[PDB]
Each structure stands twice: as C-alpha cells, then as structure tokens.
C-alpha cells in the first residue's frame, strides 16, 4: 500500500521554520515524496538485515542503508561542508517519547558504567550422533512374554549412581550429583522413583534422627525443584510431608550442638516449603492447609520445643504480609514462654536452647515489622509492654538495621 506520512505533521514543521501560508497541495507534495524515501531506505535496510543475518536488528542497518544512498547516516545534525562528519555514523540519538527532556548533570555520572560483555569464543558439541540428536544442553529439547521396566539399563544405573552419590559419602560426588539433578533434561520418567526414595527415606530416617541423611535429602529436594524441565506438582503429595517432619517433629539429640545442625535443616525445610507451594498454588488447597496447620501448631500448649522452634521458623519465612498479620497478637505469649524456661535450675534439657533460638528468631522478625510499618521512638523501656524480652538490645539491633539502610 502507499500509506504516506500525515500532512498535518508537515504543516507544523513548515510553520515552525519560517515558511507560513503553505497550500494543501504544497503540503501533500512533501508527504508522498518523504514516505517513498522512508520506504526506499527501509526496503534497502532490509538488504543488510537479510545479508548480515542479524534478524534481531542491531541499531545500524539504517546507517548503512543511508550511506548506500549517498546520504549521511547522521541523525540530529547536518553538515553542509561534509568534512568533519562524512558517511561515518554516530550511532543515532538515544531519545524517548516518555523522556524527561531535562536531567541533572550529576545524574549521568551516577549512571553506572555497564559491563562490557564477553568476547566471541569457539566452543564445540554435537547436533547428531550417526542420525540421533543427543540431549545435551546445547540442544533444544496361553504362555506369554515378559514385560520390561520403563527405565533403560543405563537410566537405572544412572539412578543408582545418583542416589548413592546423594547420600553424601563424598562432597564432590554429592555436589556433582545435585548439579545433575538440577540440570538433567531427561530426568522425567525417573521422577516417581526419586520422589519415592526421598519420601520413604525421610520417614525411616526420622525413626533414628540421622541429621546428614536428612540434610542430603533436603538438598536433593532443592535440586529437584530448580530443574526447569520436569513437571513437579504431580509429586508434591510425597514432598511436603517430608519437609513437614523436618520442621515439626521431636528431635532429642545434642541439646546445643545438634540444635545448630538441625537449624540448618530447619532453614532448608522452610525455604523449600514455600518454593514447593509456589509451583502449584491455585485456590485454597496447599496455601490454606499450610496456614491452618502452622497456626494450630503454634497455638499448641506444652508443645515440644524442637517442634515449637521449627514451626516458628516455618511461620516466619512466609513473606512480607504473613508476619504482618500472624506475628502480631502473640507477642505476650512468646514472652511468657521465655520467662517459664528462665525460671528453674534445669539446663540439661533442650527446652532452654529451644527458647533462646525461638526468641532470637521472633525478635529479628519483629525488627522489619518495626522498620517496615512503624517509626522508631522510645527504644528504652516501651518494649517492656511486650514482656521485656529484647528491649534495649532489640533497639540496638534496630539501630544497626537503620545504619545499614543509611549505608544503602
């Protein structure tokens, strides 16, 4: 079609130059001619796009199409003497429609220098091995007979090697295996056997609280989740229960030493819990179950303090609003529990260690709630209205957070 530029834009340009009182036939004369030149160049810039095999187009085809038609590719200035700026281009003008039209000179020094990317290098692979395309990451995707297992003899050997490496006898083995679990494209159709190995393992691995066996299985869950190829929400009925017992069970090992170890498993569990729910959250179901169960676990009375600490951590890592609504009306209860452990001379229990960990975690979460939607003031004895747990030390932590914010 001969869709030309509008003539009511050409009269604006003419009267903003000193040429007033132009006729419509004078003004139409320019539009047909100008549209052809734009059409002549865009058909000629198409040559450089097809020959450079650019496709995505790097700001520059019109610069060579203009130079081909013996017109300067310069945009934003025309030199009638032609000598300082010949047919070499200046890369156009980085201008916008929604721009500010007047910035600060100090703002452009603040503009960070972008990183120069990597230089062009030659790496080699395989599109086809004697006719078959490999699944490497450089590639896109009445007596009767006996049945066969749906896994190959190699795939089954791969499953055995990956599972015997993921029980963490050697770090190198476990790490490489975890990477393979997080990158294998063909790890679907083996995923029932991995989910069953995880689920079954945690349940017979909490009969005796074997922390490594559990920390390795949680890392296997995390390596299963970030794999982009496999479809996971047909198997989370076996995953969530595993992370649940890694957070809300009775763990009676070393009171202080194992608390550190089991708190790393707690961190893993709370993180992988939200990611699992994120991959399947539609309406109610998983999110509703998690919220109701966590609330019931918290409101339990005389609850094991290991279970208490794990459920506290799980409730805390749920995001911005969840602690904004679920960690408000229970501040008095948390203080009462800490006071109960403080009274008495018994220290050979895990109840005291559990109490210290719970109080520290709750106090840090309160700090963003104080920072996010409150203004600091009276940081000396106002916290005594919240049983006086962290008080001035909590105020000092808030001050350190404010200093970090000032540094940012």
């Amino acid at each position: 079609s001969n869709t030309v530029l509008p003539s009511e834009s050409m009269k604006v340009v003419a009267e903003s130059m000193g040429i007033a009182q132009i006729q419509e036939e004078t003004c139409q004369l320019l539009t047909d001619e100008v549209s052809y030149r734009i059409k002549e160049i865009a058909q000629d810039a198409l040559k450089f796009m097809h020959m450079g095999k650019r496709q995505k187009l790097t700001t520059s085809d019109i610069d060579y199409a203009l130079k081909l038609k013996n017109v300067e590719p310069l945009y934003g200035f025309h030199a009638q003497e032609f000598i300082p700026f010949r047919f070499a281009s200046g890369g156009g003008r980085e201008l916008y429609f929604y721009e500010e039209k007047e910035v600060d000179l100090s703002d452009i020094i603040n503009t960070p220098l972008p990183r120069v990317p990597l230089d062009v290098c030659l790496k080699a692979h395989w599109l086809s091995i004697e006719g078959c395309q490999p699944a490497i990451p450089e590639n896109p995707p009445r007596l009767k007979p006996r049945s066969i297992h749906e896994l190959s003899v190699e795939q089954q050997l791969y499953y055995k090697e990956i599972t015997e490496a993921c029980v963490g006898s050697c770090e190198a083995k476990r790490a490489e295996a975890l990477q393979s679990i997080a990158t294998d494209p063909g790890l679907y159709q083996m995923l029932p056997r991995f989910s069953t190995f995880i689920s079954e393992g945690v349940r017979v691995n909490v009969v005796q609280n074997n922390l490594a066996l559990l920390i390795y299985l949680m890392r296997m869950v995390k390596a299963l989740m970030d794999n982009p190829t496999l479809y996971l929400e047909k198997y989370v009925h076996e995953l969530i229960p595993a992370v649940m017992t890694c957070i809300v069970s009775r763990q009676l090992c070393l009171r202080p030493d194992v608390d550190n170890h089991w708190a790393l498993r707690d961190f893993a569990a709370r993180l992988v819990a939200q990611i699992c729910k994120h991959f399947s959250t539609t309406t109610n179901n998983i999110q509703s179950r998690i919220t109701k169960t966590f609330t019931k676990s918290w409101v339990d009375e005389k609850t094991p303090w290991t279970t208490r600490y794990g459920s506290i951590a799980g409730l805390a890592e749920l995001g911005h609003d969840v602690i904004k609504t679920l960690i408000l009306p229970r501040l008095q209860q948390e203080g009462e529990r800490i006071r109960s452990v403080l009274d008495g001379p018994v220290l050979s229990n895990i109840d005291r260690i559990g109490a210290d960990h719970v109080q520290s975690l709750l106090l840090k979460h309160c700090a963003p709630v104080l920072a996010k939607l409150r203004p600091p003031p009276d940081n000396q004895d106002a916290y005594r209205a919240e049983f006086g747990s962290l008080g001035p030390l909590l105020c000092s932590q808030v001050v350190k957070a404010r200093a970090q914010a000032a540094l940012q």
């Binding site: 349940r203 929400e233 047909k234 399947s280």
Partner: peptide, 25 residues
C-alpha cells in the same frame, strides 16, 4: 472449575500431616 486438572493434583487432594507416621503406633 471441577474438571480443572489442577484440582486432581495429588498434592491438592492429600493432607500431609496424616501422611507422616510421626513415631505413632
């Protein structure tokens, strides 16, 4: 709504608290 395949996702049809034996006999 009801025929929606997500509803039949085994995670959205199973309560995990009951799944765990949790040292119970």
């Amino acid at each position: 709504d009801l025929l929606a395949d997500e509803n039949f996702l085994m995670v959205t049809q199973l309560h995990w608290e009951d799944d765990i034996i949790w040292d119970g006999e």
